[PDB]
């Protein structure tokens, strides 16, 4: 494995639902590589239909710097218009993954709590969801890390 993820900091947390996601990513690259890394943030909604995922954003790194490297990935927020109203205040998942030359080799998942700003809203949620009052809390202390063996160069 030529690249390994060493660490993720979930920087702006808790955040508003519509705030971008700012993660500091630390990775190590052991040797020169021919192709790009692609880091990707995927929203995994609580909707039951198969389209419940959103690729939120992605960032390419290339040519890959050798050694230990630290950078910030700023990912666009979810498209609320693509999320059923009943699923905006809900427990959901975000996945940060990385691929090399299109081949995924690491994925980090987090559960995400989503609740209203104020008590009166939490106890009497309106039928029309007020997305501007929803606060997300990425449960950053409990990442689920999965690695996949891939061919590099």
């Amino acid at each position: 494995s030529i690249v390994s993820l060493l660490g993720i900091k979930v920087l702006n947390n808790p955040a508003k639902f519509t705030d971008p996601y700012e993660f500091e990513i630390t990775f190590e690259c052991l040797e020169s590589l021919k192709h790009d890394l692609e880091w990707k943030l995927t929203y995994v909604g609580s909707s039951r239909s198969l389209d419940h995922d959103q690729e939120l954003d992605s960032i390419l790194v290339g040519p890959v710097p050798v050694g230990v490297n630290k950078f910030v990935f700023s990912a666009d927020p979810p498209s609320a218009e693509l999320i059923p109203a009943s699923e905006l205040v809900s427990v959901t998942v975000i996945l940060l993954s990385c691929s090399y030359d299109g081949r995924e080799f690491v994925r980090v998942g987090y559960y995400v709590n989503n609740e209203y700003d104020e008590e009166e809203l939490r106890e009497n949620p309106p039928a029309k969801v007020q997305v501007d009052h929803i606060v997300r809390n990425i449960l950053a202390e409990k990442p689920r890390v999965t690695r996949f063996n891939i061919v590099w160069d």
Partner: antibody, heavy 119, light 108 residues
Framework: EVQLVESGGGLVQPGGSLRLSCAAS????????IHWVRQAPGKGLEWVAY????????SYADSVKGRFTISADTSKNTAYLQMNSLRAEDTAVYYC????????????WGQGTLVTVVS | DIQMTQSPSSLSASVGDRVTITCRAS??????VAWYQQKPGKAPKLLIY???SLYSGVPSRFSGSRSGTDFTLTISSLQPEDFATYYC?????????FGQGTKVEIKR
């Protein structure tokens, strides 16, 4: 209406300490990052440190890490830069700045406070 | 040790000129580049973020572009209030880094 009001500058002995503060108003610092950026006399901008008050995560420039500590009191909507073991080369105007939804660009800047390290 | 190499150090222009300022990142940056204006005795003001996004309230004659590691600020038609110093910034790689600045001065 967004304010970033700094305080704490002044003349200080080499090896001494100063605490700078940055009192924010018109936005919740919890959802932003707060940065310090300094400008030596007649020179350009040099990033110093940032904090995300929500998480407490911070970052420091190489030349100040271990000497400077950035912190935030969200209940007071205020950030702080504790500057220890000050050196001649720390003389500069120190700006407080806010980043929010701009991929760590700074969209609001305070007016700056001058730190002069002199014996 | 990422560098933002800003050129030129200064340039002279007239009102109405098209002005371009370039900042070359020493390694690839996807989008987190910003441009600032600073006038003597004043704090910097944000113009462009995310390489090409116009910050709210900034005049449309300001634009930003990315060409590989070249990041460019363009003022399509210089106005009198645009004589100032301009800084680029990258904020993808640790540490946040500014370019050395470009002073836009008045031709006579």
């Amino acid at each position: 209406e967004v304010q970033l009001v700094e305080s704490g500058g002044g003349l200080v002995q080499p090896g001494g300490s100063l605490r700078l503060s940055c009192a924010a108003s018109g936005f919740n610092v919890s959802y932003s990052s707060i940065h310090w950026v300094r400008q030596a006399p007649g020179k350009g901008l040099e990033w110093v440190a940032y904090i995300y008050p929500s998480s407490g995560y911070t970052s420091y420039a190489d030349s100040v890490k271990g000497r400077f500590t950035i912190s935030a009191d969200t209940s007071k909507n205020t950030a702080y830069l504790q500057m220890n073991s000050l050196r001649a080369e720390d003389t500069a105007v120190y700006y407080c700045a806010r980043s929010y939804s701009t991929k760590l660009a700074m969209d609001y800047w305070g007016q700056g406070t001058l730190v002069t390290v002199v014996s | 040790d990422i560098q933002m190499t800003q050129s030129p150090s200064s340039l002279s222009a007239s009102v109405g000129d098209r002005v371009t300022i370039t900042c070359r990142a020493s390694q690839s940056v996807s989008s987190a580049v910003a441009w600032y204006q600073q006038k003597p005795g004043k704090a910097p003001k944000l113009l462009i973020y995310s390489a090409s996004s116009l910050y709210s309230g900034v005049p449309s004659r300001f634009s930003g572009s990315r060409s590989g590691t070249d990041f460019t600020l363009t003022i399509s038609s210089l106005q009198p209030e645009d004589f100032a110093t301009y800084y680029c910034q990258q904020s993808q790689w640790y540490p946040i880094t500014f370019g050395q600045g470009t002073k836009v001065e008045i031709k006579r």
